[PDB]
User: Which sequence fits this backbone?
């Protein structure tokens, strides 16, 4: 069958960056023609492979990691990057093999009054491992002793993205689909 | 974790929550300004209240982390900016009485009006009294509006301002300052740096030092304007005295720019105005900003974002929406930069487009700084960046490059001198006014001026620092400084002095990097990317570095310097000296507009010296003022055969030395401009016993 890329990029539900969801793509003929030819995506940064050589290669498993980040946070979805999104929300290994696809969705995910349905983790004890997910909304203390907010030095680790249609492109919502390819060295 | 690590994560929580509340407050403010109604005021104030309440509640939490524990300088700057409390230290009783005083002072100023001699007419400050002060050239009508504003707004604001000083001094001393003026000088306070330290006492030293160098330029400009005002008002202004306060082109004498038609050097030559050449090239409001944008992209600054053009209100809306028609540049946050300007195709709005975009460029530069460090280096830096853009935009070189002037255009020395004189009336004429007014408040907060000498010292420094005489004697019932908007609005006024000095320090430094050969007033930094790169060094810093270091980046020195300002008006100083060869240069504080007809009174102390029974200090002086009116009132009815209700208001007292002497004169009611000659007054005095010979 055809790999349902239209069920990933055109999905009406994109999860938060800290709660990013992964879909397994396999046992389907891989047709990536809609990606590179179309100018829909604002980023097509492939790593460890070439976009033109995707068609030539085959026999791999594809994982599609979908989430929404800020406009300025797409820089941190590159392998070897540092930030509140790379360290605490979504980390890519330095040997990552795949392509990162992001496109502006100010029309969809941004509202005049502010769309706060998307959250990111900015407080954590230690950085995330590559392809590791932390969805625990427990209060954070710099020393590490548990406490109940509101208090001093006790904060919630998740803070909402404030998405408006009037903000600059760096503060506008972007939907990011990270594609992971099973390498020939399986 | 140490206290710096705990303050580091507190700033992360603040920066995220401050960003949304600040953006919501600014977003609500924009909708009100772009659509004035009753619903938008509620949303504007509600959003502003949330941001204010959050900032105040978060400010005390920041003080939980002492600054000395924080080793990192970036975090130390942010907490220091957040740990400032202000009126928080005051008790609930005192912090609520202060808001009552501050709001009542703004209400009195906003609702101030005078009733014309035409009885069925009230004249508000805008546009009623401002039109008389800016446009009218009648001595009698200007003194009516000038004295009327002082007698109405100033007298009501006097009791509130005395309590304002006491309450604000208590707040400042609670925050460990010496006085409320010392609190205001903390905007130029750098303490954590090494070699970049600026004290609060250093500000007054530099302000006073720089003003001593502007005085030779201002005296030559004061002498030229004085001679020209003698042509317009013959016999009403002394050739060697000061300038009457009501003849300075506006209500307060802050700017002399409205005296240009009277003091134009070469009136035959017209000004270099391109407003009618823009109308003939089909220029629009968007065209003006598009050309302003290319100026900043010429010097290497970034162009305006695509969000700027859609979001900004660059013209008055066609539909019937009330908008504020005051040009401003908006940094709402979240990368949202807007300009609200009711743009007209005129040239004056063309220069405003370069000024307002000079703010957006500053805001865009430090937009990557931490949220608490996203502002100008100090209060004078932001308004200096915009002004230097208008200096290059008004240059005939810039106008010819835009096609608004013919390529074969002669810049004659007559037109250039007219330009510098126009600049001096606005830039130089305000410096002594700004210095003197803020010096008065600094000494009033310091307690150096007792509240019984507030008006004695206000007009003593006006006649000595500004060279301006009061047309009428104001005696301790007026608050003349409070009649200005800023004084009654609890706004520091020294920012308008330092901004002028910084303006020509930036302009001279940028023109040097642009390799400009010639006078400084003909400099255009356009198409010089190196000038923009030097400018961006200061712009991107924001509040991250002390303003002394930020000043050093663009200027090369970390001290305020006025020699660049004196270099701008060097061609005008040469021309002013040639004109003032046969005119007096300088003013004498002795002469007053009422001194010639003033009658001195000698008090003979017939009572025993040093007796507690008779305290003849201040309670008995009002009887003579209300008694002399009766003598003149009876005199006019008997002799002049006309009845005039003379009262204590009509008799004016000046140079009052208690128990010794005082000078007085009488004026016709509602006609204070024309004062009765002393001979007629002495004729009434000669009718009774002759006390003074
Ligand atoms: Zn401005």
Assistant:
């Amino acid at each position: 069958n055809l790999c349902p890329f239209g069920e990933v990029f055109n999905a009406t539900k994109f999860p938060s960056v800290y709660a990013w969801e992964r879909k397994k793509i396999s046992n389907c003929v891989a047709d990536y023609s809609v990606l590179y030819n179309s100018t829909f995506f604002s980023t097509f940064k492939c790593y460890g492979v070439s976009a033109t050589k995707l068609n030539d290669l085959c026999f791999s498993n594809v994982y599609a990691d979908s989430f929404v980040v800020k406009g300025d946070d797409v820089r941190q979805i590159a392998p070897g990057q540092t930030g509140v999104i790379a360290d605490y929300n979504y980390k890519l290994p330095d040997d990552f093999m795949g392509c990162v696809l992001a496109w502006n969705t100010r029309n969809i995910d941004a509202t005049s009054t502010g769309n706060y349905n998307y959250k990111y983790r900015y407080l954590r004890h230690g950085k995330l491992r590559p392809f590791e997910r932390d969805i625990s909304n427990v209060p954070f203390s710099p020393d590490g002793k548990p406490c109940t907010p509101p208090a001093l030095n006790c904060y919630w680790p998740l803070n909402d993205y404030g998405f408006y249609t009037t903000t600059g492109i760096g503060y506008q919502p972007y939907r990011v689909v990270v594609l992971s390819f099973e390498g020939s060295l399986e | 974790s140490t206290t710096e690590e705990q303050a580091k994560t507190f700033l992360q929580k603040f920066d995220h929550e401050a960003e949304d509340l600040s953006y919501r407050s600014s977003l609500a403010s924009w909708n009100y300004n772009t659509n004035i109604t009753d619903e938008n005021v509620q949303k504007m104030n509600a959003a502003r209240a949330k941001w204010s309440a959050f900032y105040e509640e978060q400010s005390r939490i920041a003080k939980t982390y002492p600054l000395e524990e924080i080793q990192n300088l970036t975090l130390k700057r942010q907490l220091q900016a957040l740990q400032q409390s202000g009126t928080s230290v005051l008790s609930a009783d005192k912090s609520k009485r202060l808001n009552t005083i501050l709001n009542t002072m703004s209400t009195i100023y906003s609702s101030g009006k005078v009733l014309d001699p035409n009885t069925q007419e009230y004249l508000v400050l805008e546009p009623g009294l401002d039109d008389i002060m800016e446009n009218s050239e009648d001595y009698n009508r200007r003194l009516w509006a000038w004295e009327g504003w002082r007698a109405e707004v100033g007298k009501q604001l006097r009791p509130f301002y005395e309590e304002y000083v006491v309450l604000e001094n208590e707040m400042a001393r609670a925050n460990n300052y010496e006085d409320y003026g010392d609190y205001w000088r903390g905007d130029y306070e750098v303490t954590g740096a090494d070699g970049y330290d600026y004290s609060r006492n250093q500000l007054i030293a530099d302000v006073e030092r720089t003003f001593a160098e502007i005085k030779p330029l201002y005296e030559q400009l004061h002498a030229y304007v004085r001679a020209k005002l003698m042509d317009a008002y013959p016999s009403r202004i002394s050739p060697t005295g000061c300038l009457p306060a009501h003849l300075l082109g506006d209500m307060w004498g802050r700017f002399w720019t409205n005296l240009y038609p009277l003091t134009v050097p070469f009136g035959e030559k017209p000004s270099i105005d391109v407003t009618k050449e823009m109308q003939n090239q089909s220029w629009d409001a968007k065209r003006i900003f598009k050309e302003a944008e290319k100026f900043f992209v010429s010097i290497g600054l970034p162009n305006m974002t695509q969000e700027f053009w859609v979001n900004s209100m660059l013209t008055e809306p066609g539909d019937g929406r009330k908008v504020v028609c005051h040009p401003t540049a908006w940094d709402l946050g979240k990368g949202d930069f807007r300009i609200k300007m009711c743009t007209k195709v005129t040239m004056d709005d063309f220069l405003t487009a370069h000024h307002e975009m000079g703010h957006i460029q500053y805001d865009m530069a430090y937009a990557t700084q931490p949220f608490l460090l996203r502002n100008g280096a100090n209060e004078g830096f932001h308004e200096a960046v915009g002004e230097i853009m208008s200096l290059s935009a008004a240059t005939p070189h810039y106008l010819k490059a835009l096609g608004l002037l013919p390529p074969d255009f002669y810049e004659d020395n007559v037109t250039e001198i007219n330009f510098l004189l126009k600049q001096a009336l606005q830039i130089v004429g305000t410096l002594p006014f700004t210095y003197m007014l803020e010096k008065w408040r600094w000494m009033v907060f310091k307690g150096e001026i007792p509240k019984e000498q507030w008006m004695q010292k206000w007009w003593e420094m006006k006649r000595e620092i500004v060279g301006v005489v009061e047309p009428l004697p104001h005696d301790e019932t007026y608050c003349d400084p409070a009649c200005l908007f800023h004084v009654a609005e609890d706004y520091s006024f020294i920012r308008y002095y330092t901004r002028t000095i910084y303006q020509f320090q930036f302009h001279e430094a940028l023109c040097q990097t642009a390799k400009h050969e010639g006078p400084l007033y003909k400099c255009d930094i356009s198409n010089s990317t190196e000038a923009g790169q030097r400018l961006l060094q200061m712009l991107h810093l924001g509040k991250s570095e002390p303003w002394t270091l930020a000043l050093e980046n663009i200027v090369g020195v970390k001290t305020m310097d006025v020699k660049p300002l004196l270099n701008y008006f060097e061609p005008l100083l040469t021309w002013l000296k040639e004109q003032n060869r046969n005119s007096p240069v300088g003013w004498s504080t002795d002469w007053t507009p009422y001194s010639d007809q003033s009658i001195k009174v000698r008090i003979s102390l017939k009572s025993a010296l040093g007796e507690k029974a008779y305290e003849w200090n201040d309670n008995e002086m009002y009887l003579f003022q209300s008694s002399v009116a009766y003598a003149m009132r009876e005199y006019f009815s008997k002799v002049r055969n006309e009845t005039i209700p003379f009262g204590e208001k009509d008799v004016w007292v000046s140079d009052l030395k208690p128990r010794i002497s005082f000078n007085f004169f009488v004026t016709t009611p509602k006609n204070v401009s024309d004062i009765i000659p002393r001979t007629e007054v002495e004729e009434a005095i000669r009718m009774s016993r002759g006390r003074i010979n």
